Amino acid sequence: SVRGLAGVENVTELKKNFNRHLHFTLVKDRNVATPRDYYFALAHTVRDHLVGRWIRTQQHYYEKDPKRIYYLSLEFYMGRTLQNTMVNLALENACDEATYQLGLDMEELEEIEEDAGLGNGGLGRLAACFLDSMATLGLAAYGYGIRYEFGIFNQKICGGWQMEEADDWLRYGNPWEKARPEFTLPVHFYGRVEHTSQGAKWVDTQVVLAMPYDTPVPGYRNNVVNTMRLWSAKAPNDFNLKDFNVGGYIQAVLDRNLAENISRVLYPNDNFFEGKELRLKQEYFVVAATLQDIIRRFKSSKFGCRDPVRTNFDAFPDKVAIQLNDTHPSLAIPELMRVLVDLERLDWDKAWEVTVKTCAYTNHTVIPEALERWPVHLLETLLPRHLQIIYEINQRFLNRVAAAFPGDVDRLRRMSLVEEGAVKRINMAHLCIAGSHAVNGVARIHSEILKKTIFKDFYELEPHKFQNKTNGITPRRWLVLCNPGLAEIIAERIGEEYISDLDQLRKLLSYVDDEAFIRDVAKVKQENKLKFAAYLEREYKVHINPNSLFDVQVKRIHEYKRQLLNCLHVITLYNRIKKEPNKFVVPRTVMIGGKAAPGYHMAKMIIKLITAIGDVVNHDPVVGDRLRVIFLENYRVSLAEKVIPAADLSEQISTAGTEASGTGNMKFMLNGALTIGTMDGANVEMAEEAGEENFFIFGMRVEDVDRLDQRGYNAQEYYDRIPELRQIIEQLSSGFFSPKQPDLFKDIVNMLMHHDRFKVFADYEEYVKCQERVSALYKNPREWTRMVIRNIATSGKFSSDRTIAQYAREIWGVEPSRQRLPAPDEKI
Amino acid sequence: SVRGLAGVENVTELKKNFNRHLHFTLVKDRNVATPRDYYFALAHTVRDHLVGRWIRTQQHYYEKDPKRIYYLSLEFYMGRTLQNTMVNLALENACDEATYQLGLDMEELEEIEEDAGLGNGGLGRLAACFLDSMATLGLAAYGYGIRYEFGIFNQKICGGWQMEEADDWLRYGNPWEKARPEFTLPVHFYGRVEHTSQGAKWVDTQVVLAMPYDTPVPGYRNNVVNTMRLWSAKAPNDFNLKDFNVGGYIQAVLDRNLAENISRVLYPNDNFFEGKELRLKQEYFVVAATLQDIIRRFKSSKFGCRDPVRTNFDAFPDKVAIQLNDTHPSLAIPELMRVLVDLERLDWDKAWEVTVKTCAYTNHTVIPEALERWPVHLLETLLPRHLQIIYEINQRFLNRVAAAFPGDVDRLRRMSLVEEGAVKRINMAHLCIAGSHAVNGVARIHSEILKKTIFKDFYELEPHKFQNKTNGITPRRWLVLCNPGLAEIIAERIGEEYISDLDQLRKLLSYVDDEAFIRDVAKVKQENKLKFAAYLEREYKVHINPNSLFDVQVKRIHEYKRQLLNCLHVITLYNRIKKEPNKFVVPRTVMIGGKAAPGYHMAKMIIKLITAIGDVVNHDPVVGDRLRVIFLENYRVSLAEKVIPAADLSEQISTAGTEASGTGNMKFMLNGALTIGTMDGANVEMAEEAGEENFFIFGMRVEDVDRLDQRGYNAQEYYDRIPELRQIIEQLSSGFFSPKQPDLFKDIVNMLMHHDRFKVFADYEEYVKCQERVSALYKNPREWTRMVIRNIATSGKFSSDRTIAQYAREIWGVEPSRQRLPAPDEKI
């Protein structure tokens, strides 16, 4: 497969260093090495071929001094690194050969790597796809985040209920990171602010040290390897036993842990805000440690000897760009001001223009519950200087507003960064727009909406700032790595250039009429379904029918994502079957899966509904093969890599106006799945690219929702004029799915019936009719696959390479390069 | 120096892999490598030459199935590993050459290694010397202990007061250990005991997992490399979020730490008991995890297929011997019974004979405060089954006693393992004697005393059990590694066989009259003093006079060790000078140093006294060079390696009957220092070996102390008939040394005056007169060095190789081998 070359000499070196690391690094012997030990041996042999490059890329940036881009995210949803590293480094087929001559099956070894799930969902995956695309366009980019000791929890279902277990991902080691204790930085917490003479001094602070760990991010076949720097918290060795700190020496040492708890776990809220102080400590910890590392490179490169100005930050935006990934690092704006004004003693106005020109903010949601307004009482306590600075910012911001909208007192009310009233809080989004020079939404519809609805005021004050950059996916992991079959057949026809130029995929339009290509496309699909169907029973217990339509919705469980509507589709189907049982119907294996944040009662309930449905449906003998509903336990990046290649239908059903973009979207459009969806997020652009006719669009569009809201959405109307929906609601209410606890799903019936913000029932009739259109087309193999080819041929625009090329040009001001950097290494 | 060979080919391979690890393992570049990075690069290159051997020694023990010896200690005072590994592996001069051709100075690199101070003092150093000697006699020995995240604290003096800081020794990594997460074992805590039908079941327990980390222990030049296995505590991934454990998911994850706190720090009590539950948790944690690893090797070796008996432990003592190092692992006796009786279902009597024949206990102190009596209320709670077993043990033990001493009710009272009265507690020492087959003291005098005083009852019941094994020191680290000069000059004359046969040192008796040898001996001494004097000012600030008598007492600060008496010697001297200031007196640089346990008020006070004295004395202009008193900050194994080669006088002044052996002793006897000491611990045997005349023995002997105690020790008698002592006590009381806080040393004057158990003042007159004899002899260079040669020639018996050869033969039943094992490695 062209997975590259496979080459006698390299095969021989690879074998040799696999064995060098088994012995010397693992200190294991072939007589007692387990597959885990072979995985480590191989990981560490691949790692070695990337070091030369890593060291050369950073040496190279040092002397060539480019504008560096720092991407700040509190999530990086990396996934497994091995195969991806082999892909981007071209080692895949050399190693496959070598591991077979050692006798090992490489793919068994890949399954032993545990995902780095340092992320919840799409926000963190974006950052990881971004990372790959910044390396592939050779940008000097660095992604800074926290090294959580426990990442997102592992979901285990027991009784149809999510049982969350900790993700002890570092348990056996991580052969990719390189701890860098030489560069530990202190971060200060609490303190008081002494305003005396020269300025304010943040004094009496508690120190937590941030210890960096670097991971390499290899660009695809272009020899650039950039760095992902993740901080760890470490308690100071001195103050935790200094002062006249008696308490108990032994307790003093046991108390170190409290400071280290800043990097202990990722907060599992799948965008929704939580005012917890340890989260605020994380968010400040990232920013402070990172910005010291930013200032440190600025002062050392080539300004390294630029002598007699003072030291000067006029050039700081031409050498630094930092990208705020959602508001979670907005303290970079008051911390950058704190450093510049209080420490380098710049004039506030100068410092502010350098800050605005460095910062940029990406907004991910319109949903209010996810927005961060931190209580000013907490900010006062933990970070008093930053509260002062925010207050001063706000001041001057509002004075700018006053002058522009003379007399509109409510504008001042709306636009203030401080939300007055009862518990006065600080709106992080407003901070970000006030101090960034560019603000972008992630899909064009989400950016129009940001300009009309929530930030309209800021749009009117500074229209110039508002931009859009539709999200994207990296074809390497999302095509080449999870679906090499499709990438091979595509490559036979149009070559391999498309892996770093996805737009070339549209030359496949010439093959929508090619019968060999149709056979091929459908064949990779059926093979993938077979490989997944087997996974399903070999790691769990299943018997699914592989010639079903594999209908799947995998994403975080939430009510706007509307898994419930899909649930409503399933029993309508089960019941349609159940009433005229000898009617032919196209078989569907509906798989729905995703994690639910602990505590979100409703999402935990929705999960039980799906398993409840599966319990009934999957054991009704009158259904047979015809419907299988399966809930996919513990979704994460490695399950996404197995289920999206096997999927036929992609469920993307948000009430129009709630999904910002959606990136799962895009992953199924390559991989040949057909989308059923509403016009929301990026589904709009995927349908423009492939054409309305090659998409199954149903549902109300945004206006229609707003029309309904001004009328008054009343679910009772639906219930009363739709009999099928009424039978479902009755089954749910009677305990048809909960035989021994009828009472159970009344909670969900209640929200559906009475206070459902996401208007599940108004989209139901269209949903169901549109689903009959999907089965109509699945019965004609040839035209489903032609629709599929037009979808695949058209997903080029959803590559993150395009997205980063746009961020680069229209916001960071840096130009992309596909120019390969020369790196081998030394050999002397 | 013959430090071995230095050899063109090996020099070339070493350079090459130093560079392989700088690049590939450290991912650093010569352009940015710091000395720390070069230390890691070198450590990791030495490490590589030991792996072949390690793997071969364990493969070899596997098939050759010997009786394995497990040494259980809760302390292992390792020190730095690099140079020692080079010594024992013969790589020292190959690397010195290689690092010079790379341009680096090896000795700068050795100073960057941080001590593994997993120990307090002599108890833990013993274990580490034992480890080296078991490897050198090729015994299949394993040392099991805890991997503490923080070892003994680092002492920092501020104001003459000890300020203790945490020892963040793992901060930059430890290139020697090999984490072994494949072998994590659970340990159970709390629980209840359900006695039903077949036996008792320990049920409902909390699980902590013990995760092993192995370190290699290379024998000197004989290619055996044994293993030191240190456990780490890890919290279970399931129960810390299972049950219906709501609390807060995020708190659940933050609570993992509590279980991990079992391996967080070493308890800094420098033998003295502390009834703290986390200590009991450590002690049980070691034993349970270790014994599973012991049972595991027994059941797998060659009994691995010994089929149809059941599985049988009759051969367990012929294949296992575990050595209890002080009572801190005595739970191995109830845990071995718990496993055998409750889990393998053996008959209690059979299980007991296998237990007694496996176990052996080494007793280290007669001092009551150090003995562990655990409160039975704590044992009930944390370990209920083990309390039952201890009770049953006790029963049967006392019934054995009753039958042997019919009617001696008080014997039953004295000998019970359970100390009744108010807080009923369990005497660990009695447990150990009851269930071990051999019990030994560590110096012959300490064993006679154990038989007469504290365990006389147990002696009379089982005389056969009581043995002695005088402690020893390993000539490799304590001669070859800290003092290669002396080892070279010794080697020129008598060859190198003495490094694994220290008794050969006595052929040096032929050179007590050799003038070249005298010049040589004294020359290495003066050079060593110069190297230490320079250390002293380059890392601190000092100007000491190098041609002084370097009089030094370095050991843990405690009142029985009597640093106070030495303090009394110093101001007598300062005052003698001060009254007739133009008298010649032999200059002395008195260095006293050692850590004091936090909390031991008196030891913390004694430290301030010494610095107080130094403050006065060292700045009196009428003294000049004549007296320097210096307190050596932060004593540990690497400072011992620098100060004992430079020392002239070795202070070993315990009230006779309190030091068990003392091992510091021995270190100064090689290295050419002359001992001033009482007849206590092993000073008795060092004086038998070198002869009374070559030792400065003063003080009362044991009888005399016991005579005094029956009279009534009254310090006032001394005060009143000795004027010098009276002036000192007055200076202390008046605030002569504490000008601004006179009140300050009255605490120490009070204990001296009124309740001094260690009878400082009764030994004073002899002490001082004996010290005048030492200065008399230092004025005649030639005969001090001849005395020195007779001391050095005689320290052969204090090698730990002898001690382990005796443990081996008279207790473990295994024979030593100096036979080299063949190990290179593979090369194919």
Ligand SMILES: OC[C@H]1O[C@H](O[C@H]2[C@H](O)[C@@H](O)[C@@H](O[C@H]3[C@H](O)[C@@H](O)[C@@H](O[C@H]4[C@H](O)[C@@H](O)[C@@H](O[C@H]5[C@H](O)[C@@H](O)[C@@H](O)O[C@@H]5CO)O[C@@H]4CO)O[C@@H]3CO)O[C@@H]2CO)[C@H](O)[C@@H](O)[C@@H]1O
């Ligand atoms: O040296 C400069 C300056 O420093 C000091 O000013 C600071 C204040 O002392 C300090 O309290 C803080 O002020 C905050 C204020 O606490 C916060 O609530 C917020 O004020 C906004 C309201 O939130 C906003 O609603 C609006 O109030 C209007 C509202 O627009 C209007 O629609 C209607 O509903 O009536 C409301 C009542 O007037 O505007 C105000 C601001 O005008 O923001 C404030 C500024 O961040 O921070 C100040 C800046 O450091 C000194 O006190 C001052 O004398 C000095 O000149």
Ligand SMILES: OC[C@H]1O[C@H](O[C@H]2[C@H](O)[C@@H](O)[C@@H](O[C@H]3[C@H](O)[C@@H](O)[C@@H](O[C@H]4[C@H](O)[C@@H](O)[C@@H](O[C@H]5[C@H](O)[C@@H](O)[C@@H](O)O[C@@H]5CO)O[C@@H]4CO)O[C@@H]3CO)O[C@@H]2CO)[C@H](O)[C@@H](O)[C@@H]1O
């Ligand atoms: O199936 C066997 C057996 O099991 C059960 O016996 C157990 C007891 O129920 C249980 O309490 C526990 O007994 C302990 C006892 O608690 C503990 O205090 C200790 O008893 C010693 C005294 O400590 C010791 O001083 C001495 O008492 C004498 C003393 O020698 C003498 O000098 C003088 O001063 O008078 C004292 C008062 O008599 O001896 C006793 C023991 O004789 O040790 C006990 C044993 O460990 O553990 C028992 C064993 O499991 C059942 O209760 C019993 O009926 C069954 O036969």
Ligand SMILES: Nc1ncnc2c1ncn2[C@@H]1O[C@H](COP(=O)(O)O)[C@@H](O)[C@H]1O
């Ligand atoms: N002081 C310097 N002299 C030469 N090269 C340097 C220097 N400082 C940093 N570099 C190099 O540039 C790299 C990038 O480091 P950093 O600035 O920490 O990301 C290093 O690993 C070096 O190769």
Ligand SMILES: Nc1ncnc2c1ncn2[C@@H]1O[C@H](COP(=O)(O)O)[C@@H](O)[C@H]1O
């Ligand atoms: N008990 C709670 N803990 C955390 N989030 C909650 C809680 N109650 C409501 N929310 C949230 O508000 C949202 C809607 O949940 P619901 O209240 O069940 O409709 C989600 O984003 C939830 O996470």
Ligand SMILES: Nc1ncnc2c1ncn2[C@@H]1O[C@H](COP(=O)(O)O)[C@@H](O)[C@H]1O
């Ligand atoms: N199952 C086995 N078959 C062959 N060799 C073994 C086996 N089990 C243990 N050994 C070997 O003996 C060693 C010592 O292991 P251990 O018993 O854990 O100390 C291993 O590293 C192997 O080389």
Ligand SMILES: Nc1ncnc2c1ncn2[C@@H]1O[C@H](COP(=O)(O)O)[C@@H](O)[C@H]1O
């Ligand atoms: N406050 C205390 N904490 C710990 N050990 C103590 C304490 N008080 C007395 N001891 C001990 O009893 C011993 C003698 O100390 P002292 O009471 O100062 O004479 C030492 O081994 C001490 O560690």
Ligand SMILES: C[C@]1(OP(=O)(O)O)O[C@H](CO)[C@@H](O)[C@H](O)[C@H]1O
């Ligand atoms: C917060 C969020 O994640 P999620 O898919 O988990 O809801 O960020 C992604 C990346 O910008 C978006 O594609 C997505 O619509 C949005 O909801």
Ligand SMILES: C[C@]1(OP(=O)(O)O)O[C@H](CO)[C@@H](O)[C@H](O)[C@H]1O
């Ligand atoms: C407990 C102890 O340590 P220390 O030297 O720290 O007091 O064990 C050592 C080894 O058995 C003995 O030599 C020593 O006399 C004894 O006191």
Ligand SMILES: *Cc1c(COP(=O)(O)O)cnc(C)c1O
């Ligand atoms: C692609 C991906 C997502 C994004 O899915 P959405 O439906 O856009 O939220 C989330 N989680 C994982 C594991 C993914 O790989």
Ligand SMILES: *Cc1c(COP(=O)(O)O)cnc(C)c1O
């Ligand atoms: C040798 C040694 C000791 C032992 O000294 P004693 O006076 O016997 O207690 C203690 N600590 C260290 C650092 C040593 O190397």
